[PDB]
Design an enzyme around this catalytic site. Sequence first.
Site, PDB file in Angstrom:
ATOM      1  N   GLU A 188     -80.719   3.603  48.479  1.00 37.26           N
ATOM      2  CA  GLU A 188     -79.874   3.085  47.416  1.00 37.26           C
ATOM      3  C   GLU A 188     -78.964   2.033  48.031  1.00 37.26           C
ATOM      4  O   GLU A 188     -78.161   2.340  48.922  1.00 37.26           O
ATOM      5  CB  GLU A 188     -79.095   4.230  46.772  1.00 37.26           C
TER       6      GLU A 188
ATOM      7  N   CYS B 115     -70.124  -0.449  45.671  1.00 30.66           N
ATOM      8  CA  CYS B 115     -71.417  -1.091  45.464  1.00 30.66           C
ATOM      9  C   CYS B 115     -71.567  -1.569  44.028  1.00 30.66           C
ATOM     10  O   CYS B 115     -72.283  -2.544  43.772  1.00 30.66           O
ATOM     11  CB  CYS B 115     -72.557  -0.156  45.844  1.00 30.66           C
TER      12      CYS B 115
END
Length: 1214
Positions: free
Chosen positions: A791, A825
């Site tokens: 991820e 993020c």
Amino acid sequence: APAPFADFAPPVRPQSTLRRAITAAYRRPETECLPPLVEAATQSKEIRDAAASTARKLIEALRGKSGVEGLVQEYSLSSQEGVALMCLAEALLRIPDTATRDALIRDKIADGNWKSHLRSLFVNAATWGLVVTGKLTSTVNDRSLAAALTRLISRCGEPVIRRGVDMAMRMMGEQFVTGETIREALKRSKELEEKGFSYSYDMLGEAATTAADAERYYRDYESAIHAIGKASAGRGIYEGPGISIKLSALHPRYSRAQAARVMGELLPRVKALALLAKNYDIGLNIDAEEADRLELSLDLLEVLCLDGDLSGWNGMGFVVQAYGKRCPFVLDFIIDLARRSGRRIMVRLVKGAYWDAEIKRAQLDGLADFPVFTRKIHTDVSYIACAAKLLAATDVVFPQFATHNAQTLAAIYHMAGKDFHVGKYEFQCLHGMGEPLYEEVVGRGKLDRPCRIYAPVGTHETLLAYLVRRLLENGANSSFVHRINDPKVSIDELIADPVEVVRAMPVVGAKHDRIALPAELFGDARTNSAGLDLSNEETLASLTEALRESAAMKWTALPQLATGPAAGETRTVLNPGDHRDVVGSVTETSEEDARRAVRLAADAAPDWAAVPPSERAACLDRAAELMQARMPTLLGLIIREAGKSALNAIAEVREAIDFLRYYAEQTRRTLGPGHGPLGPIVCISPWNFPLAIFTGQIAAALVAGNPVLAKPAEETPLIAAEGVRILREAGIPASALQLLPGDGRVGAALVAAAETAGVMFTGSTEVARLIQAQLADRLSPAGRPIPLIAETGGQNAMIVDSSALAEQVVGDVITSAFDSAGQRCSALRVLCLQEDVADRILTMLKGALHELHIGRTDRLSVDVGPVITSEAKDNIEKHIERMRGLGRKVEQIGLASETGVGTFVPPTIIELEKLSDLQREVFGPVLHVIRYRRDDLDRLVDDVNATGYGLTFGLHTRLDETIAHVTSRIKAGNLYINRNIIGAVVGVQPFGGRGLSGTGPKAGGPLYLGRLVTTAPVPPQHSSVHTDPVLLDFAKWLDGKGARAEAEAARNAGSSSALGLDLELPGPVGERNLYTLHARGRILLVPATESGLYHQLAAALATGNSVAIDAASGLQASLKNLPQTVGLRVSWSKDWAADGPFAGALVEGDAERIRAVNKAIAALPGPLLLVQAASSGEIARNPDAYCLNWLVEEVSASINTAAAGGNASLMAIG
Ligand SMILES: Cc1cc2nc3c(=O)[nH]c(=O)nc-3n(C[C@H](O)[C@H](O)[C@H](O)COP(=O)(O)OP(=O)(O)OC[C@H]3O[C@@H](n4cnc5c(N)ncnc54)[C@H](O)[C@@H]3O)c2cc1C
Ligand SMILES: NC(=O)c1ccc[n+]([C@@H]2O[C@H](COP(=O)([O-])OP(=O)(O)OC[C@H]3O[C@@H](n4cnc5c(N)ncnc54)[C@H](O)[C@@H]3O)[C@@H](O)[C@H]2O)c1
Ligand SMILES: O=C(O)[C@H]1C[C@@H](O)CN1
Ligand SMILES: [Mg+2]
């Protein structure tokens, strides 16, 4: 060097007994609040009968004596036509010149195409929709409205346009406001003043976003005070007019967290306005706003009432909201302040204007209870009880009973008794709403009680901004004004005594059945994590001490192997915001011990796998309890080690708690004896969520039955060691959870170890690519690829069109871009502004930027902390200087000198020409802004997609056509509509992107655990009734070719596929949280046999994908004469790297063929590919040889349904 947390959140002043009693009631259980209110509101049977008779008389007069309804009637308009007409009239009124507007109507609008001559016409259609229909629709169906407007014009022509214009002109000039300007409003007030009414003018300012806006609202108030005081001409504060102000209008950071700025900068401004009100001898009322501003406003009221410069004037007023649980205790405080100061405070008692927003906020923040009642009748009882308290203190305060409810009015009228004089108390009502009631009240021929009219003043743009909230005050199902207009509601129902109805209930004060406490948002599934109220002084004082204590602790992180802690190289961990503040010490792991840990994990794997899933889930739930209990100490560690603010550290511990409980519940829903663990799983985590993402990966792997090697980021080992300590206390055996602190060399040694059976990685795409490459020539003992969840980074965009509300946009942008110094993020990297609104939003954004406080995060007043390291700082600053060197406009906050002791980057806005000006994710507080023309919106979405990333994405628009277009074309894993793009909530916005941003499955989603076992279970709710039609065409083709077994396997895949799943997940009110399964994209197929190819194609097509088939397979002759629908999805690829990017791969072959293919796939440019492999024999034996879970893509969409100003669903909840 300042002591850690020594100045975290000191209150403005020591909290008195009266103030502490207010704070104690903040979230008091509803069953505890009501009994004293019932007692205080009780009146004699004689009075209750007399009040009921008065209430009936007023209501009979009201029902015995609208413009839009008559217009809809005359022209036979549908609801959508009525709304569209009002939107057209609104737009025509933006033409300032009357003759010019009339000419456009006559020669252009009436004759046909209104589009050419006329920013969507329908920007405010949600407001007009409330006007026309009484129902709130959060977004605008602009294609329906455009159709209705063409239809009505073509049917009825200029006369209907004329009537619409004149109606909108009257409503916006005389009904929603008393006048456009204070002078116009004053001129129109004479008529009712002669009849015995008075006025308080509402200049409609609120929620300043910038210093310039606050200054504009200040000068509006000041100019209004002069006009009102000139017109008052010595009438005084009771007979003569006054003004109302909102404190949020006078400073852009009006909040408890910024209390020092509020007292230092906002207070002098209120004082200056009050001094002017004193000189004219007019009232100046402080309106009441959100619950988290109540107690702070009391500090301003205290200082003003004690300020000798304001002595001799009794015009200072203050609103208290009876829907609030603190109301009676606030009144006790105010009455005592009036006695102490000798100022007869004007106290406006209201019910409250922000109800649905308070419900949503308390739910979002996971707090113990609401700060408002949840049953409307409870607010009514509270109001009457507080009225009794006020009427007992008319010698020291001036009560002002603001209500449109005739029952409430009558109850207070008879409560006040027979003695009255002007100045004892008054009623109040809203202009253009309460006059029908109050003309039955004012005057020697009625009840002979005065009423002050709250009179909005402003232009169309000003009044439209928050008109929805005002329409909901009297327009909800439980509202008196709505009910008196409902013929299905009897006068007996309207005059029912709320005090006696509450008294006779089975459970006095019970919470509303249909509103969940924050802890119960998810019902039986799991317990919501709980937060902390940083507006509560008791909480701030308790937290201050816990945070201080956490800074005194000698935090350590050691390599915790199965056999005990191991020796290694030790160093200190320094606070990124001040390198003089040593947080702890980390002993890092040798490559030898990392390899030893994997062997110990492999030896421990059977013992951990044998712990039944429910007991593994029980450990996770115990760990969540421990983290919840330890939250204050955990906050302190996250603040100092990771440089996070208090609010963000709360949210991070909450996320960790939610991961533990979510994966525990998902385990109890799914895992059985046939879902065997992979084996030792290496969990590698980033520094920026050093507890939450760390805990999530490890908890998922553990509960799936796998022993874990936990490798935290080198920057943040201490909170990781504390997380591991907690998991071990919760019952995870040491052999099942080993901690390996250190840098990327430790991570790489763990990945490369022979017994590693799976890897969970969250971090940069570049590092994920190195991990992918090391796994490429490696297979499990069963001969299949080692699963990798990777991820990775984002280049997250937000698109804003001309229908969005600038103030909302700016708040969501500042938060999304600069929260956590942009080190999420999910953070907003590229803001895309429609050209027509770009300059105005940019100006506001830059103004809001300079209101941020940057510094060491052990102070509540700090908004943005440091970046994690000097290396990060240099990297981010190099990007800024490159942009600046290229001539791009760069805006930066100036940093305080105190920041030199740490590693800070000032929040920065960079104006780009094209999205291509950006190359890679810049992981810092750096917002890039591009502009676009509306016709280029689709190309812009292309530009966003073309970066190759696909993590978070935001859209601010009111327009359904734009929502449908943008959300259907954007390719990102987490979408956000009319809200910020950060802070995804476990199980509500399952989090994770596609392309360069992730392989999936999503953390916090229902596919995650299935990746961590060798046979994936069926997740809860995971199915679809839809069958892909290309799959169906392929199955028919196979039958026609005689491939009957493969055709049946294809139909089976079509049914098994969950493509098309479309679910709403439970979450807070005022938001719709959706979870859908889509195709991944183009899947690379590497077959070995004809039957293998057909099985691969069936799997890919059943999941909605297109394919590229390896031309080197030699199987081209196996796909002759495909139906065109299938051929459209099929390409043949000789050079795979040329025909990508792909979204996954299916491989057939023996072990060494899989290895060779996996190496070639890993070398392809672009995104990491989720690869599945099988032998020809496994394809023959196992219908699930290729698992369809990994051939669909999860998409989460979070839509703020309260963005229009209220919550339509909660309008039915009373
Ligand atoms: C002159 C004037 C000044 C005002 N100043 C302010 C201000 O400074 N600050 C402010 O917040 N508002 C202010 N208001 C608005 C007021 O608070 C009410 O929102 C509004 O006037 C409707 O209340 P009511 O007594 O007229 O009617 P009602 O129909 O009797 O009461 C409606 C109210 O009930 C409450 N309610 C509805 N549903 C529920 C529920 N499920 N649970 C608990 N309570 C519920 C809400 O407060 C709602 O507004 C003012 C109103 C007037 C007339
Ligand atoms: N998609 C998501 O959910 C998500 C969440 C948070 C952060 N991120 C990404 O994480 C990045 C920031 O975090 P970071 O700086 O800690 O990432 P990073 O890539 O620098 O390091 C992450 C982890 O990998 C380890 N590492 C470095 N080299 C390695 C190697 N050769 N082999 C094995 N492990 C190695 C590091 O020690 C660390 O534990 C950003 O790009 C951010 O976007 C993504
Ligand atoms: O910041 C966010 O959006 C959530 C999801 C993940 O990024 C960790 N915190
Ligand atoms: Mg890094």
